[PDB]
């Protein structure tokens, strides 16, 4: 039973609270801050996270074509998105649809990236990957 | 058959988020960084934003009780989820659902705030302010 019973108000607030911030000033664009939401999704504690590129969430069966695409996406310094196979701290798997935006200072330089992460269904993942031509 | 699930909506909802960063170390906690999404939604250019407390988005029909709760949260270094009525640069209004995330330095002082903002519906706003007040009883 799912059809009537969707709580879009909690869903939306949850949406706002799963994120990381990265610092492309630093080498390999590490995560430097992370939300509690992100902790709960991934299962990793802060100490295992900050200082790294969140490509650590990737693993064996992650699509490299997709990874390639999103790195290409981020390269000019702009706002793109992607769905990727991601591994929890316990090795379990989940689809991660996430959206990356650049933060800019008074010089119009990208100081930081912010990324909101959304766990999504196999069905969703099929869809978004099928639409690749 | 009937294809789809909740995660499709969640995905759509997270795609509507945009971001700012403020600096409470500075006077009056001004915006210092912003994403393109924040400019589009509000209508202001980057130049017109950076350096201002983002209360400039507020106006005459903004719930003052809500604004004050925000101020309390900020003073205490707490996170805060809230829906406000904001005004674009052109005068038009919209409901702003946003999450304020406290950020600390190594001394454990608040040095930044991260803001995730979101345009939401009259129905959303209605329901949410309605869910408040009850909470106050
Ligand atoms: C990670 N989300 C995420 C969040 C931000 C703000 C940024 C800038 C990147 C991501 N990534 C992508 C990752 O860091 C990396 O850019 C890609 O792997 C492609 O580049 P490489 O160097 O590996 O070729 C995220 N990747 C994820 O797997 N999950 C996320 O949530
Ligand atoms: C502004 N969003 C927003 C984002 C962050 C990260 C922070 C710290 C604050 C906000 N505000 C609140 C506003 O700046 C101000 O701090 C409050 O009004 C506090 O009370 P006072 O009485 O000092 O004004 C935002 N307010 C909005 O209206 N819209 C935003 O997007």
Residue numbers in the entry:
A (entry chain A): 234 to 366
B (entry chain B): 234 to 370
From the paper:
Aureos typically consist of an N-terminal domain with unknown function, a basic region leucine zipper (bZIP) DNA-binding domain, and a C-terminal light-oxygen-voltage (LOV) sensing domain.
As expected from the MALS measurements, light-activated PtAu1aLOV crystallized as a dimer that features an assembly similar to other N-cap-comprising PAS dimers. The two PtAu1aLOV protomers are related by a 2-fold non-crystallographic symmetry that does not apply to the A´α helices. The main dimerization interface is formed by a network of hydrophobic residues on the core β-sheet and A´α. Compared with the dark state structure, the C-terminal part of Jα is unstructured and the hydrogen bonds between Gln365 and the carbonyl and amine group of Cys316 are broken, indicating light-induced Jα undocking from the LOV β-sheet and subsequent unfolding as suggested previously.
